[PDB]
Amino acid sequence: SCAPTSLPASATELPTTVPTGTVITGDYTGSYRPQVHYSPPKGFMNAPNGCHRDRNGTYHLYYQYNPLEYVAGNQHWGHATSDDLYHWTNQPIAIFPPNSTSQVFSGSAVLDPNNTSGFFPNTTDGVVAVYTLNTPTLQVQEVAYSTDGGYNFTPYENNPVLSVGSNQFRDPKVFWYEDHWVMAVAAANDFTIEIYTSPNLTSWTFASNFTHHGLLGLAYECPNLVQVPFQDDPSKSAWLMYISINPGAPLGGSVGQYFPGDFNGTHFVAYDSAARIADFAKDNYASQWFADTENGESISIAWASNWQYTQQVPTSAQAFRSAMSLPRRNYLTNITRLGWDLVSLPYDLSPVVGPSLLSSSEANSTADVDFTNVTSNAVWFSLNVTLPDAAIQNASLISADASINITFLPSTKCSGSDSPAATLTYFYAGLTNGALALTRPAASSSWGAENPFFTDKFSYTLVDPLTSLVGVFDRSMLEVFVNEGAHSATMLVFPDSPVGSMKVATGGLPEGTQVNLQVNGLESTW
Amino acid sequence: SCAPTSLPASATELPTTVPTGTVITGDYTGSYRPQVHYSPPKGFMNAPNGCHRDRNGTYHLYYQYNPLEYVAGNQHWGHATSDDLYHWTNQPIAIFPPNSTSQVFSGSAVLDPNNTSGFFPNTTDGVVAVYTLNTPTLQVQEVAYSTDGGYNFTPYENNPVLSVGSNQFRDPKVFWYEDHWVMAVAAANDFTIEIYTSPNLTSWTFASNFTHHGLLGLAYECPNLVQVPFQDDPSKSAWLMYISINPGAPLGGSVGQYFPGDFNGTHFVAYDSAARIADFAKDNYASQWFADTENGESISIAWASNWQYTQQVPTSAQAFRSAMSLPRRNYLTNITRLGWDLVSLPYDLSPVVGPSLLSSSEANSTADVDFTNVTSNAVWFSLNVTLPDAAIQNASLISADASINITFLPSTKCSGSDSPAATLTYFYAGLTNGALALTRPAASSSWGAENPFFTDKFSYTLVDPLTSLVGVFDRSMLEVFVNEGAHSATMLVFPDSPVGSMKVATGGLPEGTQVNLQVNGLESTW
Ligand SMILES: *[C@@H]1O[C@H](CO)[C@@H](O[C@@H]2O[C@H](CO)[C@@H](O[C@@H]3O[C@H](CO)[C@@H](O)[C@H](O[C@H]4O[C@H](CO)[C@@H](O)[C@H](O)[C@@H]4O)[C@@H]3O)[C@H](O)[C@H]2NC(C)=O)[C@H](O)[C@H]1NC(C)=O
Ligand SMILES: *[C@@H]1O[C@H](CO)[C@@H](O[C@@H]2O[C@H](CO)[C@@H](O[C@@H]3O[C@H](CO)[C@@H](O)[C@H](O)[C@@H]3O)[C@H](O)[C@H]2NC(C)=O)[C@H](O)[C@H]1NC(C)=O
Ligand SMILES: *[C@@H]1O[C@H](CO)[C@@H](O[C@@H]2O[C@H](CO)[C@@H](O)[C@H](O)[C@H]2NC(C)=O)[C@H](O)[C@H]1NC(C)=O
Ligand SMILES: *[C@@H]1O[C@H](CO)[C@@H](O)[C@H](O)[C@H]1NC(C)=O
Ligand SMILES: *[C@@H]1O[C@H](CO)[C@@H](O)[C@H](O)[C@H]1NC(C)=O
Ligand SMILES: *[C@@H]1O[C@H](CO)[C@@H](O)[C@H](O)[C@H]1NC(C)=O
Ligand SMILES: *[C@@H]1O[C@H](CO)[C@@H](O)[C@H](O)[C@H]1NC(C)=O
Ligand SMILES: *[C@@H]1O[C@H](CO)[C@@H](O)[C@H](O)[C@H]1NC(C)=O
Ligand SMILES: *[C@@H]1O[C@H](CO)[C@@H](O)[C@H](O)[C@H]1NC(C)=O
Ligand SMILES: *[C@@H]1O[C@H](CO)[C@@H](O)[C@H](O)[C@H]1NC(C)=O
Ligand SMILES: *[C@@H]1O[C@H](CO)[C@@H](O)[C@H](O)[C@H]1NC(C)=O
């Protein structure tokens, strides 16, 4: 059986009224439907919201959700739960607008076990959502509380809790700092993150502004102010302001950027005036960090799309638009020359890793790996390359031809051009030394070639040699992680024919180079 | 009849020894050879150097030049002169390395009419070049002087004039401030522009550092610190620090960025912590400003290429690699919401503008313009759109379909895919409101499709409606300028078949919208 390219009418037909108190049933069998990423059972999804872990260890993912269309609008908070951030259970819609002319825009959630809010006289498991209500004339911050573990929310009786009389004032991210609540919120079209403080989540006082930092684009969105541990030393950490911008990103549309710095409970001060882009492709946006994580883990998830084409991608015939990124483990590190770097790695994938397709220690060879018998149409790969120390001390010893080439090739079973669906090319030396290209050839996709914003080629240039590469392919998405997650990219692909194999080639590698390649099929979560 | 795709052996064969005191003869007839842009007669060119206007109105363009190969190396300063920045005369090589193991890297030139240097006891027309000398172990700043108008240079007897014992210290840009010389120079791998002062161009004193601003990439290069007049008010100006970075640009490889701010003769202070990219495509790098211009004119030129593919472009069979951008008139303006903006417009094109190919006032139409009779294979176009007052006040009145689509189509006489060589698509509203796409379809170019770094699609998103668009096509290059040069892009194209025509379509425009389209052929300067 080939995965279907179109579904039954009952799978794709959207209701004319929003379902309340019942799970929306999903057909997750589409040829483009990711099997280890979250996507909504039906309809259009964007930013992750309300991300938190409850005391029982359940991760709550909420999401911007149009239950009525395959385009942006009518925003509700959708809800899915998981104990491992891969095996998702769909839940009833969590937050509804008060009427048909208002929308529940992005926001965050916190546990209030000490009842600072006063909402929780008889429970230590209270959840508070802080979110933007979009009116035709205003964006205001509102509060809603849950006594049932974050499934049903009661709006605060004296909403809204915060307004500045603006229709560009959104995406509150709330967290506890020592003795008070902090809110980071975007004065979106003023390129300002405003910081407010509160003892009880309902009374907010202005603290400070963070304005005109890094790339402006056309708006600041979905600010996250978080403490991120050092990759090489868990006992150390720094504060990080993460800001999403859209439109006006360098590659077009939407992108995330970050600022390492100091936070003292009222003011964030960046360590320098540099701009730093989080992902070197164009399908990673609106990253939100999970509240109430265990063991000083920095855990985030993003929307794996771009505002320039998210409402036009050819998945609506498969009963959805938009998926989340892999869930991410985050660290800070210093990389050679550039210094500060936001590290992103896939959150523990062990619960979805299936049997080995290939284990190889062959250097200067091509490994040809078929996965047509992997029903998920999803694979994980790991490539380690360890140069001899002679080639580290003297890079002039490396051949101009020393390179890595990865290609994802169309299925022989589920066919059509022979073009790869996705390529990665890296050079150790030569005229483009350290250059890594990630491509989705226009030739592989009639839709992609025609969409004016669907960029074919992305690149990042290393200073250090490439020593590790991890990747996940999941039907219509490729994520890559270079040098223990120092550099990462999230890339959508919509090939005319589904991918059925991958080739991993190394060439021109120095004598004594160690190569280790591992490829595993992934098990579907649905 | 058709422009040659391959030239005689004598046209492309490079000498084995560098010619001294003689002009290198060029064949400028190649199907990819620009006819209104500067490119070297033979060999490989990169960054513009020594840019200045002499007292008699001759513009001097020097350039990084490998006379021996079609790749980077063996750097000399090549030299060309013009009175209008379009009609270039090739000159003998201006600056030579002192031996076979050193290279003349980038730098600047200034007039020294008051003989501050002591080089010019008997002339007020003295020119001083300040440039990086590259050795395998060091980058140092050197001085050479010319008494003959900048054709022949004598090295300063006590070179070098500035060393810090670094191998990453280059691209000095020198200018007069009130009572002293200022040098902006890149501590390239430290992401620092160092400012030095001198009474006499030979003795340099450290003044200040400008460090870790905007995008770092992998290196700061070719800093320019210049006073740029306001577009709306010639009597006002602000200081601007322009920095080129490579590699590590968001689109891959090389890009220019800028910082508006204050300069007081010793210290540059940016007005804010924002990063601002100069050009929204990937083929505009190492912009240098002309010294000693007239009438408060800010004039610059850039290298129209990208380091990721400049040494691989398919023009070596046509006796060259690399062209300059159009010469640019620069201003600063405030654009809606985003604020500070570097304006770039083509410098007075009137000396190359040939007869009209089309004048049209038709809205909601497709104009087909054939230019197979324009021997230059170069055209200028101008498109104005004036929306009615009603739609300027209420944009909700604009149709989702309101759009402008320009395509450059392959010649049928000199061919074959029917793919456009280049496209521009802009939307007034709909789901991607204000989004402008500039594309070079992979389908149009076998070389382009295969090159892993030759990105197919670029975009910029407007806030204001598009009201003006100017463009120049020149055989293998397209430059576009949006809303009186508020936004600009430089894009190389290497189509399999030469461009023979363009289509300009408007559609879905509000009742009462005024459209004016002008297209002119350009006259070859060679
Ligand atoms: C913390 O930051 C917030 C967000 O930036 C800030 O609130 C804002 O203040 C600015 C003023 O600095 C407001 O901007 C103005 O809004 C009015 C109404 O639309 C405009 O008429 C003003 O126009 C003039 O000034 C502009 C900027 O120089 C010019 O471009 C223009 O031509 C006019 O001369 C101006 O745009 C803005 O509306 C608010 N935004 C919000 C969301 O409140 C707040 O003041 C900061 N607080 C502290 C303590 O610093
Ligand atoms: C102005 O900026 C320049 C350039 O950044 C400063 O010089 C530089 O100083 C740094 C130290 O901050 C040097 O880094 C160092 O590298 C050497 C060798 O790798 C190492 O031994 C040192 O311990 C240090 O890590 C850098 O090399 C150097 N660069 C250059 C081009 O000289 C300068 O100090 C600044 N001046 C002021 C007043 O701030
Ligand atoms: C762009 O707008 C800014 C902010 O309005 C201008 O900067 C100021 O200009 C006024 C004079 O009109 C000065 O008094 C202020 O001190 C300036 N700075 C600030 C932060 O307000 C700037 O001049 C404008 N630039 C252009 C090119 O128009
Ligand atoms: C809909 O709800 C919004 C937000 O509470 C409010 O501003 C608006 O007046 C409501 N309209 C109606 C008629 O219910
Ligand atoms: C929250 O605290 C503020 C003081 O910051 C107080 O004015 C307000 O009454 C409190 N609200 C509730 C509902 O307890
Ligand atoms: C935090 O730092 C700022 C200066 O950046 C200072 O003004 C403020 O008072 C500090 N707040 C606390 C709680 O110390
Ligand atoms: C990066 O280096 C800087 C300068 O030494 C240091 O202050 C910072 O703690 C380092 N960060 C990490 C993550 O190692
Ligand atoms: C499935 O495919 C893999 C990779 O080609 C192969 O190693 C494995 O033996 C196959 N298994 C079956 C049961 O076909
Ligand atoms: C690398 O080897 C070359 C000779 O092959 C030598 O000239 C050079 O100095 C060496 N470089 C280093 C970093 O040791
Ligand atoms: C590859 O190197 C990584 C470091 O990024 C390490 O965690 C992993 O165990 C190695 N994989 C193997 C041995 O193939
Ligand atoms: C990888 O592909 C590139 C194409 O740019 C090629 O130049 C390089 O030699 C190849 N390396 C391999 C097959 O390992």
Ligand SMILES: *[C@@H]1O[C@H](CO)[C@@H](O)[C@H](O)[C@H]1NC(C)=O
């Ligand atoms: C890989 O090829 C390079 C360059 O030809 C060579 O020096 C090296 O010994 C080769 N290694 C293997 C494992 O064949």
Ligand SMILES: *[C@@H]1O[C@H](CO)[C@@H](O)[C@H](O)[C@H]1NC(C)=O
């Ligand atoms: C070559 O010339 C440069 C610049 O004058 C000088 O620094 C270098 O030492 C010279 N090398 C030799 C081998 O003559």
Ligand SMILES: *[C@@H]1O[C@H](CO)[C@@H](O)[C@H](O)[C@H]1NC(C)=O
């Ligand atoms: C340049 O000026 C410095 C400082 O006054 C002085 O030491 C030096 O002799 C001058 N050099 C020349 C060649 O005039």
Ligand SMILES: *[C@@H]1O[C@H](CO)[C@@H](O)[C@H](O)[C@H]1NC(C)=O
């Ligand atoms: C220039 O400005 C800096 C502050 O940015 C100051 O330290 C210096 O004294 C000023 N120099 C002059 C010549 O005024």
Ligand SMILES: *[C@@H]1O[C@H](CO)[C@@H](O)[C@H](O)[C@H]1NC(C)=O
């Ligand atoms: C467009 O408008 C400008 C306004 O200055 C005018 O100079 C120019 O002639 C017009 N260009 C076209 C499209 O005719």
Ligand SMILES: *[C@@H]1O[C@H](CO)[C@@H](O)[C@H](O)[C@H]1NC(C)=O
């Ligand atoms: C331009 O192209 C877009 C699709 O990219 C299309 O929707 C629009 O209707 C076209 N408009 C014109 C003016 O041809």
Ligand SMILES: *[C@@H]1O[C@H](CO)[C@@H](O)[C@H](O)[C@H]1NC(C)=O
């Ligand atoms: C353009 O076409 C639209 C849709 O048919 C129409 O409403 C509008 O009046 C037309 N405008 C002009 C300027 O012809």
Ligand SMILES: OC[C@H]1O[C@](O)(CO)[C@@H](O)[C@@H]1O
């Ligand atoms: O994509 C992020 C942006 O879109 C929204 O989520 C609305 O669905 C906003 O709250 C946010 O600024």
Ligand SMILES: OC[C@H]1O[C@](O)(CO)[C@@H](O)[C@@H]1O
């Ligand atoms: O392209 C810019 C860079 O390349 C050089 O011009 C050398 O040819 C350097 O001077 C500069 O940093």
Ligand SMILES: *[C@H]1O[C@H](CO)[C@@H](O)[C@H](O)[C@@H]1O
């Ligand atoms: C969906 O699309 C595939 C090919 O893309 C067809 O094979 C299938 O029948 C359906 O139309």
Ligand SMILES: *[C@H]1O[C@H](CO)[C@@H](O)[C@H](O)[C@@H]1O
């Ligand atoms: C659900 O959506 C699909 C794709 O548009 C339709 O083909 C189907 O009939 C139903 O409307």
Ligand SMILES: *[C@H]1O[C@H](CO)[C@@H](O)[C@H](O)[C@@H]1O
């Ligand atoms: C369940 O109730 C909610 C209340 O907001 C409605 O929006 C929904 O349509 C359904 O009736």
Ligand SMILES: *[C@H]1O[C@H](CO)[C@@H](O)[C@H](O)[C@@H]1O
């Ligand atoms: C330019 O091309 C000619 C052939 O036309 C060669 O002979 C020459 O060496 C250079 O490559």
Ligand SMILES: *[C@H]1O[C@H](CO)[C@@H](O)[C@H](O)[C@@H]1O
């Ligand atoms: C003319 O002289 C220069 C040195 O000034 C040489 O490099 C060139 O080859 C020719 O002899």
